[PDB]
Design a protein around this nucleic acid. Structure first.
Lengths: 74, 93, 74, 105, 93, 74, 93, 74, 74, 93, 74, 93, 105, 74, 74, 105, 74, 93, 105, 74
DNA sequence: TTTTTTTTTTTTTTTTTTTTTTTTTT
DNA sequence: AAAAAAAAAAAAAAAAAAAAAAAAAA
DNA sequence: TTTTTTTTTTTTTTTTTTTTTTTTTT
DNA sequence: AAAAAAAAAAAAAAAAAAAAAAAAAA
């Protein structure tokens, strides 16, 4: 369950200045793990803010309340 | 454009992962939350590519390995203890 | 116009994991500058937001509206 | 305790330099927007500090120099350039060190 | 809008002036005090504007001089006294 | 410490019925003085009212006691 | 004082009008309010007098006419329309 | 119903600084009207504020909130 | 002139926690006198207050300015 | 309600005494005044009756007589004077 | 913060009518209570008066308009 | 002298309970409120002692007990409530 | 005392060593372990120094050189081959010592 | 990563019977390497012993089990 | 209790790498003394460690604590 | 093997001496304690013998005598005092060798 | 109660076949103890026997039955 | 004769210890039984002394020590333990 | 047990040599007398073993000789006299050893 | 005629407190003689009793009358 | 070829200098 | 709030020891 | 008298042989 | 029950190395 591995590769390659940069097979696998943890934290934190204000879904208001702490964590 | 496609492909699997959370807690999100996390993931990957480049350029080889990687999940220590665990398993490959 | 040298020093020495970490003069000096522009930018962004939403003073709501981009830039 | 008193002196200078910005715009600050930046300043020092330690242990020196710092100033581009400028200027403040230390020839 | 952004800038100035007076006696001003003075001084400038224009027009000029100012502020005697003093420092600058 | 010419200039151009009307630099300097004395007297008068009735701060109640007099004087 | 019992006759004329107001809407004013309007107009008479003299001096005269007065009521235009009418009622005599 | 002629006349001749000044009868009849209307709208506006914040009568606070408004018009 | 006998009697039996409590006819005639003077002095000093601070009818501010003093006397 | 019903019957008799005071000094009552004394009497009768109960029980009895009633009006001196006279007049009944 | 039992006894013994009078242990503790409730209530009501007339601390005027009713309840 | 000190000893204790009250309402005490609350406690101790005496000698005893003091809080319901609570609590101690 | 100052400086060095090893094995080193290796190492140095002296004076020299050191490291063969390998690079680093002084023609 | 040269040299000079004894630059570098291998051996040996007798903790007891041979090795 | 000439003889000839190594008559009788003192000191220091922690018999953990100290002595 | 049989011969004499010390201090030994001091003695003779070897090689001889051995237990002062004294009683067995050896007259 | 130091001494010196024999003090003090054990266990066995064959008192017969046993012990 | 005189002092001390036994069992001893103890004591010591002679003589020696004595009563084992213990008591000297 | 075995062995020879005396005296023995002398010699052997221990212990040796033994039958003097005669015959059985192994010429 | 060499050896190896205890050829040879006279006299004493009380065969009664004196000589 | 002494050169250790970091003072 | 000292590490020069070239012999 | 080499003579350690004790098998 | 081997220790004789006396030079 999760992210397409070629997606992750290509996303990274767009942002290398010197594309002589390569990412190892094992580092790619860790990256899929990282992406999981990144997105899920955004999601689960949005949820805990919505919970706190008794919101009925996660609205953009609560998301943006969780951007600050996510930025600190990354 | 080709990068806007990647934002949207980030969205496509960001569309699926926040639904595991919807099964788990019994709290679902607006589709506006789904769109804003995907944008965030792509925007953020700019700094992580730059960041990983800084690290790999500083360790003076041209491929990034596991070291530089686990160092980029540094800020929260719940994240970090969790991160090292999964590296053990991928190395058994 | 900015921060006190030994103030900024004490702040950072509060969080060092290796206590053998020490800070050279030029590093300290540029830190005074960074904290200056750091906090000024928080203020600048806050004012942009108050003006932009046409509030009669700079309030909490706008501040929160400005926090996200601060941390993207740092 | 120890940390909170440093935070309070931090709160002071923030009040002041936020007044410089209030100066610039003829638009007013909530004392609370002030407080927000102070706490944030403190927790940001945490991350600045954590990162500068990992730099320095991994370069086999125990005193940090300008290079680690300017690696820490990587994120927006106006930041990176602006910082470099000001680094050569205060390097002249320590060239003064050489002018005033008596040089015998 | 014109008035509103310019009132917020005036309110800031007025906020500064009240802080100056608060500092003197260590007797501080309410939120509402500051605001009411800011709006009063903004509307006071409507009286200044119209009057200055009528008196300039009234002496067949369009361009307002030192005499018009001092004409307008003739009102409290300690003030006309002290403002004539500051016009000497102005006549020097 | 005090009022900018540019500020006074924009605010008063907002209320002129004749815009051909321009203002001499001398007039402008004297009114920097008039504006300042007006506002500082309002503040000082507010403070005297609060002290006279033994308030712990200068409130709108006291201001309202000082408004009538300020405006007859202006 | 000349001013004092004449402030008493001002206090009087204005007291007439405040009672006629107590008729129309069927509710009255406080004692200090009566006093406050009497004082206020007295202070207002300072504003009237100065300005009127400077208008009569603009027009090469000492003898005061219709024009200075209706130009004194220049301020609110609801008033300016009401008073030009009653000036026709007076122009009859 | 309103202002007494001799009253109005006496009041104004106390604050003139040239005594050569004589006032025509219709201009004084005008001043009877102008002062009548002064107090009228002073009272009318005092009335409208008491109503507005829903006061028990027309009392000093309300008036002083519209004292700004009255002395701008005068 | 005033209070009826039954008014007072029924009124008393309302707040009795024991209703075995009886009232003699002379003591009933006397409570008529008491509450009669009760209303009269409640009114008198309410009235006397409106007139002593120069009010334009008998208004509640004046009664309640005599309320601490009246409930002392009763 | 029975409470409200008694309130309106008491209102009658309090409005009586208040109207009779309107006769003597040529001075009229605000109507808020008439209600404030009708309400006052009603809850004052809680004060009077609870204490009257307490008094009657303290003196060997359950039936409240002349003694307890005369003791309840002992606060201001014109009240004490008032009460004793009327007691001899109705003691004749 | 609770009334000194030595204080309450000597205070009681100064103006007793029969000198046969002593105070038992529990009774004096309860007098400590009754006096403690007395001071607390006198105090609560004094604060309640100053803010009602919106004073910026509790001066004699306030408390004394509450001292009338203080003696009736005690 | 001896009674001057008892007024002043009453002053310190009344002042502690009254500064307890400054916390709760968000409003403080002037010297005069404090000084006027202390005078009353001292002067109130008179009629409490002599009523306690009249009660104690009136029951053929030389010492006042628990029942004379609870009888002294008689004409209010809430004093009954609170003080009986405190009487069952001090019976524990 | 002065030896206790130097024992404390030794704890620092062992700490750095064990820090690097702890991140290699992905398991932290105990408080006791770091302390015990610091004291272990200082104890070991007594036997190093005395044997070194016995060797220097046995080989008719006042200054202990590389031969006496390698004599001391005789005991485990994985240790002895380590020493000679690294000795080549330092001997190569000595080629740098010869090179820093300028040469005649 | 090895021992610092200053440290090793002063620790050696601690035990020379003749202080005329020096440590040569290359001998000092050999000893930097040698003390690394010695300590690495002790830690490596200890870890293997703890894990061999199946402990979550490498205890002093395990280090003591490798002491006999460690000291025979050095 | 005297140690044996033959025992020490064959024991020594175990770890010789040169067999030409002979043990003179007195050198043999003296290693009798060295081993005697070593065993008496290993045994005596074991009892002194068991004594120290008050054991009621001499066990494994006591010798392991004097293992550091015994290695250095011999 | 031949080695573990020598381990068992050593175990005998140590068992003897462990009981003699058990007699002096009125407290006996665990059977496991006896085993551990024997393991100790066997592995001690490793450092003894191979230390004795480089001494006989350090004094440039093949055959070990009293001087090497005296220097082998050089480490503790109570022990050192003890060994030299018993060197005179062993020399008394050589005086018996004075009774043995042929002297011509 | 019982054996003098001197008694046992005299007794021994009486029957020494070589008169060179003196007795050390402690050896003398041990014989009081040995003679103590000797006689009283002869006495204890006399009683145990009186008791065994069912008797009123301790007589010659019972003792001479326990004589075998005593010789065996000494 | 010398030897006879000392047999009487022996009987005395034999009498000593027999009495401690008499209170232990709360019962009675015959005097001829006391008499038979001194006889064998004296008979026994003959053998003890001449045995000790051969032991000491055998020891390369002329005078008695602790080891000769502890050899002499090797036969009953309750006795062996008893005496080794007693020997640490006397060894205080 | 092993000892039941060795106990009954004693009985056997006791049975025989006591028959020598039954013959000599014209009086026959009860079987319990026979059984008794056997168990008695057994008891005696504990005392023999113990005593002989403390004799050989006492002479700083572990191979026991005639003198410790002549000392064990010390008690009745008919016996020590008997023993010496028979120990002197042992000295004559000693002469037999010198004949066995032959000497030089 | 008499005891068998090995027999007596293992019989004495039954009661040794140290089993390292030896018996030499001659000593053992004489052990037999001891036991020779031991039982010689056991038998001889038993019959002198049977004759002295004039028995027709030797029973346990006589034997047990000859036990005491045999023990004392040994 | 063998044997001995003086001058210069280089190496390692110890002390001191010089700089950096942290606390206290006015 | 601002400036200097106190502590600690590092580096540079002085002390210590040997090795090369020049002087004298057998 | 001074210098070096070979033969014979004696000394101390190691191994092996020879004796003594213990234990098992036939 | 009797004999011999097995195990251990002691002692004996050969191995190892030096020092004395005789031979040739300085």
């Amino acid at each position: 369950s999760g992210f397409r591995k070629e997606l992750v590769s290509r996303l990274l390659h767009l942002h290398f200045k010197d594309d002589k940069t390569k990412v190892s097979g094992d580092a790619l696998q860790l990256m899929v793990e990282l992406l999981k943890v990144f997105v899920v934290e955004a999601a689960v934190r949005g949820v805990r803010q919505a919970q706190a204000e008794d919101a009925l879904r996660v609205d953009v208001d609560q998301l943006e309340k969780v951007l600050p702490q996510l930025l600190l964590d990354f | 454009s080709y990068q806007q496609r990647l934002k949207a492909a980030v969205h496509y699997t960001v569309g699926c992962l926040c639904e595991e959370v919807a099964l788990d807690k019994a709290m679902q999100f607006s589709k506006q939350t789904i769109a804003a996390i995907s944008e965030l993931t792509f925007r953020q990957c700019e700094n992580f590519a730059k960041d990983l480049e800084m690290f790999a350029r500083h360790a003076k080889r041209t491929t990034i390995n596991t070291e530089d990687v686990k160092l980029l999940a540094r800020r929260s220590n719940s994240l970090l203890k969790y991160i090292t665990d999964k590296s053990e398993e991928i190395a058994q490959a």
